[PDB]
Design a protein. Structure first.
Ligand SMILES: O=C(O)CCCC[C@@H]1SC[C@@H]2NC(=O)N[C@@H]21
Ligand SMILES: O=C(O)CCCC[C@@H]1SC[C@@H]2NC(=O)N[C@@H]21
Ligand SMILES: O=C(O)CCCC[C@@H]1SC[C@@H]2NC(=O)N[C@@H]21
Ligand SMILES: [Cl-]
Ligand SMILES: [Cl-]
Ligand SMILES: [Mg+2]
Ligand SMILES: [Mg+2]
Ligand SMILES: [Mg+2]
Ligand SMILES: [Zn+2]
Ligand SMILES: [Zn+2]
Ligand SMILES: [Zn+2]
Lengths: 597, 594, 594
């Protein structure tokens, strides 16, 4: 019966394709399966997880500060495929390598493996549960910290939520295995970060409060985001309970000369340790990372080679190689880094359907300031509206829209708003002058109206009045924390709603999912009752089913491995159904599914 | 009739396609054509060189505080990312834009390397015409080439007189700055080339090729002294500029700060840095080299940058913008030109590799940037795509077997040939050098160990040697000393009778270097004509039904050509294509080669 | 210019196929062009006798002639019955001259009238008069014979007297020598006019008696022997030169032939002429019984268009007679050569073949005319009925008795057809069609006949029927006496306006008969030219790529047309066809009708 459901999934995808893969490039036919590397046999060295359990978060930050070596965080399991493969990487490929990280790289600070877009995408597009994913990683890497990206008041969503929801979600994330919460607000508004940061601390976990980087601190024609802006924020966040401060350079804008100045000043403005995250869209972020290291930063993020570069993080193997033998040599075996990269390479070849057409570095990023994680999504959202051929007009409009909003931090979800505005400006051939024209009726996107009303918070100098008065068409804006206006979610009543929808009790984790993504979670749970635990399928089978005659090994459970053979597939019948003829462990099964064509 | 020959090309490729493109990826359909940006030109380095001469121009470079930039898009850039298939049409069309928009540039690397060969062999076009057109579009910038020293633009050592005659014509054809290197860094084998460039009163930039890791004490053959010594011996040889040629992108940042400081202390000549970005961090190295006072550096336009190419020009410039050493180049024009190169590049989709980004592995195999892609594909030909990571191990093993050597063109091609033989034939290094296993080497390897590409500082490993040349005596003198000085008077007669028409000195120089490729190119050019004036989508795929094509035969005549219809194949085997040339109809028969 | 119009047509059909052929079967790809037999080297014939003797005196000569006289129907009923009348002027006229030299003892060629008039214009884009003219030139020694539908002429409904008067007049100056005139219900008063118009044109009037039922069946006395001997008598006094028995459905059995023709000869002095169809598969017996009983003339089709719904086999009937007292004296080898020509001609018309396999005694149950049988089957395909065809044959017989047991022949047969088809489609019985409480909605064909428009049976239309089918009070008077005498100076103005031209009288006769069809035809002639001159493959499928074609625009002017290429469809929806016309290139545009 879990078998019957998996067979039903295999049949269906075998018969009808997968919607996400059906009209997109296919991997190569021969395709080496990814192979988990033989680990020698050495048992697992205590690492940062054991320390954190011993010291607690405050003393752990202090240990970070004091540590001479630079500490490394791998983003391959989260930001890496978010930025290069539309976040489509599956639990099957992610979980299987965790053990290897654990044995072979016991000195990593952490694995970035959760939050950001993975929460949503995992259910909506992958038909899998992000909590299963987290538990599997936890169990694979019990010596390393596991790290999520949490969007402050926007949780793992796109809009500000009631405080009690944000609090509950953080309670479940803790219980579920997150040790290190990198938490950020899209407008760098500390007031809108206080709820999350306190909730992370109440769970006695690491609150790594981020400052999003934008602009250029070494260009005095843009004083709004100068050195003081950043150092003052680090102080404000220390006062607010951070254990760690991050610099989240979401679009890869920090340049090397600026990192030398920025990190030296930061580490003079707070005693807290500093963690630097960047993207390699410019083709020079490895330089920026090395300068950060030379200037005393405590930790840096990087991605495995095979999922590094471009809009992803810069190359982990190559940064380690450059540091090797230096004073702050981080102590990681490069041969193992390259072996895990080789697994990642083979993994990634399976996701050909989700490759973008991005060819390499672009200094254009200094102009548009599109976060790495948005770049691709937005390019497609433009392809979508027939603007493929004017991508460079969209990047210019994005820069113009940014200035029109008064020069703001653009990261989820504020980047989406600037993205909508840019797309509209181009579709409709409107300049910013046109947009704010008294004489010119403009249908602003809902998200722009909503940002200008106050729903995403407050940029440090408020929203420009003229654009605002015109966007709002008379509705009054507000400048209070958006969560202070939201009715407190009635948790007991909400639980009952979804429990009736599903005719069963749900877990607290699942409720946290419902609270964040009610429709998406509902759809996923209903899909799960039909198809069973399809996350256990290897990736080609999940996206393409089984070829004629093909044999598949699946582990429904720890004992039980299902051997499944596709023996034949019928023509479509009068009732519009197709019958797939499987052998399950040498026994014949006929599974009927619809012809969805 | 210059038209008739062209139509014959457009009919032939329309019906049959182009062999280099028939079974590789097509571009998108709509395909934005590349647009030359809308714009007198400021004197730059060209005029300066003309004023000062090479020696004093090298000095002007040293004294110069700003870092000088060399753009490699027109040569290494597509060599490294597109098997060098970039066409004159797209290259010449942007030269003027460079000339007016980036007049501070030091130079354009736009010639030599694999372009001489590939231009004719795979693109049906004259590399000299390409040079002349670039000279005409960019009369204010230095044109730079890569010279393979005793190898010229080919894959083996030539007689001196053939080397001298070639350098004679390159300068006459418009080269100002010759980056010359020897593939095993043997100075005696450069002397001939560097003297010849001096004699034309052009800039000799003599390159020391980088390899290994100067900050790792367990590989000492390539220490710092080894670079500084070579610098000094090259100054003494009459260099105007010294280049560090990091052909595989091996120089790490910490290293660059030590190397460059020391080079500038060792010699007073300016220093020029070339590297590739296979590692993903070469921009860090380039910036460190600048902070250490390097006088000039190479980069490629964003759109043909990264991975096996040079690192990103726009971003490097941006990282420098406002600093003491700011190169003073307009980022908005950098971007405009990059957007052109991106549009251009989409037209070469057939030639992309499947390389997805940085690889720290380059520190293991030391494969040069502009080999990597090619050798990956030579392994898929020998059917070894499954075992690519074992090929790379062989290259590293082989390298060591050969005594640990500089792997650059053509020595790199030879470690390549040894590497792939060992994957296929399932062979170790201990089994490579073993007495009981008979093991036929590739010609290339036979050649190199007899001494045909010169001598590594140690000389070749004795046992590897006494097994490879099946008995024959190897030589340790300089290949050109033994090679007889070809009668240029005589070798000229043989090419002219083969063509039944007198050739130019430029053409003859293309004979000396590449007799059969040039010959094959020349007979193609009496059949098909000046194909190089055809836009690139037309060159590779012909004209679609209904389609309309503007072509400039000279600059005077513009031909307007419309493919109006195409018949089925007849009994005589021939297909007729119906054109409109400036409103008057034409029929062209072409064979069906299916 | 006429060349241009032809080019236009050839392009249009090459690009878009022909609506009559696109989704029907295609002849074999190799296809032997039909070949006109070379006649060894004209004896005057039956045409010269009629010019000499006059018609009354000519019927005498027929009568007294011992040998049986033969009429070949290959040109008319033959392809009307087997190929939906699609046979083209090009193929018909080409063989006339061969008949003329090879079979000079023939009585006549049935080559005009029937469905040819309609179909030549509507489906073949050609003039029936040009057709007649061409046959007249080719065979100035045989009588040309047409089928005239009395009051209906060449139409499907009764026309005004002066129109009929008119049409006959034109049909005579056009070359018809022998008119076989018949009324679809055998009503003589309604032949009156037609016959008085033929007589006044000093041509032959072969008044036809339609055969139905079975004279030797005591069970169905309505059509007994006196029914036919009295109709002869009456028709002689009406001025006939020849008495014809037209057995349109092939119902006359051989025993019935001995009796009918011995008796017909006793009743009138006029010579007799027998036409029958071979649906039963025994009609050749009926024709031979008829000969042995002294019938003066009989119809047969060339072997290759004989059998089934056509006439029986000319060659075999002649072979049957050869050497007997009534031997018709036709060379059998020439019959065969002409048949082989028609067999090649036939294969070009594959698209119009029925799937009729052969003999069917069912014809005695349903009495469908040879000519109808196939159309009515396609028509039952048209309405969804191939699965129940034998129920439709039962309906048709049942409807016949319902109308009171009548003569079924164009146009009365179309009427029974429509009725039968309805009766099935609605699962309606004879009882239900008739009963008081049952709202049947009758076809336009059914009301019109039972209102009087196609005339009167001997007994009248059944009372009950007419009352229900009608409200409109009926008419037992002769239709043409109620229809008004149309002013044909006025109507002539009408057509000459729409076509903005002086038309000839031939063409005016076509207008009067088929106003919309003639009009659509003339407009199309304007667009496309004399498409009738094209050979048949080309008319129906145009020209393959590279195919070379010869067409005789005038008689002294051959054109040479090559189709050399066909472009893809342009943004305007147009396709350009690239011709060579007499070595000079031509480009023709036509719509992509897809
Ligand atoms: C879900 S994914 C597999 C299957 N294919 C569809 O199109 N729908 C289901
Ligand atoms: C050599 C030329 S390239 C165009 C034409 N088509 C071929 O396949 N070969 C010829
Ligand atoms: C008329 S007949 C030939 C041509 N093709 C069409 O479909 N219509 C015209
Ligand atoms: Cl939702
Ligand atoms: Cl050659
Ligand atoms: Mg520290
Ligand atoms: Mg300098
Ligand atoms: Mg007689
Ligand atoms: Zn990120
Ligand atoms: Zn290079
Ligand atoms: Zn008939």
């Amino acid at each position: 019966d879990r078998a019957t459901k998996l067979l039903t999934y295999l049949a269906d995808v075998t018969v009808n394709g997968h919607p996400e893969a059906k009209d997109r490039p296919k991997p190569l036919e021969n395709a080496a399966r990814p192979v988990v590397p033989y680990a020698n046999g050495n048992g697992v060295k205590d690492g940062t997880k054991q320390l954190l359990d011993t010291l607690g978060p405050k003393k752990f930050g202090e240990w970070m500060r004091n540590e001479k070596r630079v500490l490394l965080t791998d983003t391959t399991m989260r930001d890496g495929h978010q930025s290069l493969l539309a976040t489509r990487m599956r639990t099957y490929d992610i979980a299987r390598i965790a053990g290897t990280y654990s044995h072979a790289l016991p000195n990593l600070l952490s694995l970035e493996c959760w939050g950001g877009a993975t929460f949503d995408v995992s259910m909506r597009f992958l038909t899998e549960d992000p909590w299963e994913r987290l538990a599997l990683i936890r169990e694979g890497a019990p010596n390393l910290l596991l790290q999520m990206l949490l969007r402050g008041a926007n949780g793992v969503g796109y809009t500000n939520y009631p405080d009690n929801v944000v609090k509950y979600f953080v309670r479940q994330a803790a219980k579920g295995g997150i040790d290190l919460f990198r938490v950020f607000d899209c407008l760098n508004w500390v007031e809108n970060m206080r709820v999350s940061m306190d909730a992370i601390a109440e769970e006695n976990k690491l609150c790594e409060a981020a400052i999003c980087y934008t602009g250029d601190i070494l260009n005095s024609a843009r004083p709004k985001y100068d050195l003081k802006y950043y150092t003052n924020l680090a102080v404000e966040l220390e006062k607010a309970g951070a254990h760690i401060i991050a610099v989240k350079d979401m679009a890869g804008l920090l340049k090397p000369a600026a990192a030398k100045v920025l990190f030296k000043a930061l580490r003079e403005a707070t005693g807290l340790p500093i963690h630097f995250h960047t993207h390699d869209t410019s083709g020079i972020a490895a330089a920026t990372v090395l300068a950060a290291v030379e200037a005393g930063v405590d930790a840096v993020d990087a991605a495995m080679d095979a999922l590094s570069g471009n809009t992803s993080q810069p190359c982990l193997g190559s940064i380690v190689e450059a540091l090797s033998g230096s004073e702050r040599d981080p102590g990681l075996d490069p041969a193992w880094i390259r072996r895990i990269s080789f697994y990642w390479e083979a993994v990634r070849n399976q996701y050909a359907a989700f490759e973008s057409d991005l060819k390499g570095p672009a200094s254009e990023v200094y102009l548009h300031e599109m976060p790495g994680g948005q770049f691709t999504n937005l390019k497609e959202q433009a392809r979508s509206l027939g603007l493929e051929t004017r991508w460079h007009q969209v990047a210019q409009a994005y820069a113009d829209a940014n200035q029109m909003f008064g020069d703001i931090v653009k990261v989820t979800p504020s980047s989406k708003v600037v993205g909508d505005m840019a797309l509209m400006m181009v579709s409709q051939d409107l300049t910013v002058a046109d947009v704010v024209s008294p004489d010119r009726e403009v249908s602003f996107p809902e998200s722009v109206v909503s940002m200008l009303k106050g729903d995403l918070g407050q940029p440090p100098s408020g929203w420009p009045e003229a654009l605002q008065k015109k966007a709002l068409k008379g509705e009054k804006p507000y400048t209070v924390r958006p969560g202070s206006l939201l009715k407190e979610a009635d948790l007991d009543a909400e639980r009952k709603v979804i429990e009736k929808k599903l005719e069963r009790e749900v877990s607290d984790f699942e409720f946290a999912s419902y609270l964040m993504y009610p429709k998406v979670f509902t759809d996923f749970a209903l899909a799960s009752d039909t198809y069973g635990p399809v996350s256990v399928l290897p990736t080609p089978a999940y996206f393409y089913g089984l070829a004629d005659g093909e044999e598949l090994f699946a582990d429904i459970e720890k004992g039980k491995t299902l051997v499944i053979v596709n023996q034949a597939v019928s023509a479509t019948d009068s009732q519009g159904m197709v019958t797939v003829f499987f052998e399950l462990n040498g026994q014949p099964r006929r599974i009927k599914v619809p012809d969805r064509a």
